[PDB]
Amino acid sequence: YGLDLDCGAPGTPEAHVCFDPCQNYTLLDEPFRSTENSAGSQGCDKNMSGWYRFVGEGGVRMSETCVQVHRCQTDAPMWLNGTHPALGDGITNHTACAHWSGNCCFWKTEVLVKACPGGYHVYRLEGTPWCNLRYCTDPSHH
Ligand SMILES: *[C@@H]1O[C@H](CO)[C@@H](O)[C@H](O)[C@H]1NC(C)=O
Ligand SMILES: *[C@@H]1O[C@H](CO)[C@@H](O)[C@H](O)[C@H]1NC(C)=O
C-alpha cells in the first residue's frame, strides 16, 4: 500500500494495480459487533481480508478504548490502540488490541485505517491472531 492507494500482491503482475480503499471495501451491517452487546454465540473474524466499512446500529467505527470481555459477539474483543485519521491523512497503520485475562492488549495485530470522502472510515483487516476475537464497533459513533 501507499499514501492513498492499496495495490496488488508484490512480485506479481498485479503489483502495479492500485485502488482507493474508500471505493472498494466489504460493507458490514452487523449490530452484534457493538461494544455494548453482551449476547450471542461467540464468533471470530478469522476469515476477514481486505478493506471493510462498518454501518448500522452497532456503530460506524472501531472503539478507541478497551472493550470489556465477552462483548461484540466474541470472547476477546478487539479495539483500536490509536487515533482515527482525518480526511487527507492517507492510509495509516495502527495496532489493534484484544482484551483478555486482565490484559487490554493480550493479543495484537496490525490494521490499516483510512478516512474517506463522505465522512466515513475504512479498515484493512487481515484475519485475527487467535479465536474467538472480533473487531468491535462503537455505537456511540452513529
Ligand atoms: C478490491 O480490493 C481487493 C483486495 O482487498 C482486490 O483483490 C480487488 O481487485 C479490488 N477491486 C477493485 C475493483 O479495485
Ligand atoms: C495504546 O494503548 C496504551 C494503553 O492505553 C497506551 O499507553 C498507548 O499510548 C496507546 N498507543 C496509541 C498509539 O494510542
Numbering used by the authors: 42 to 183
What are the paper's exact sentences on this?
Glycoprotein 2 (GP2) and uromodulin (UMOD) filaments protect against gastrointestinal and urinary tract infections by acting as decoys for bacterial fimbrial lectin FimH. By combining AlphaFold2 predictions with X-ray crystallography and cryo-EM, we show that these proteins contain a bipartite decoy module whose new fold presents the high-mannose glycan recognized by FimH. The structure rationalizes UMOD mutations associated with kidney diseases and visualizes a key epitope implicated in cast nephropathy.
The electron density maps reveal that the GP2 branch is a protein module (henceforth referred to as ‘decoy module’) that consists of a β-hairpin stabilized by a disulfide bond (Cx48-Cy59), packed against a globular ‘D10C’ domain with a new fold including two 310 helices, nine β-strands (βA–βI) and five intermolecular disulfides (C163-C8157, C285-C9172, C3107-C6145, C4113-C10177, C5138-C7146). Interestingly, although the GP2 branch also binds FimHL, its D10C domain cannot be glycosylated at the position corresponding to UMOD N275 (R165). In agreement with these considerations, introduction of an N65A mutation in the decoy module of GP2 impairs its interaction with FimHL and mass spectrometric analysis of the glycans attached to N65 detects the HexNAc2Hex5 oligomannose structure, indicating that UMOD and GP2 exploit a common molecular strategy to counteract bacterial adhesion. Because of 60% sequence identity to UMOD, the crystal structure of the latter immediately explains the effect of many substitutions affecting invariant positions. Remarkably, most of these mutations cluster within two structurally important regions of the decoy module, the β-hairpin/D10C domain groove and the disulfide bond-rich region at the opposite end of D10C.
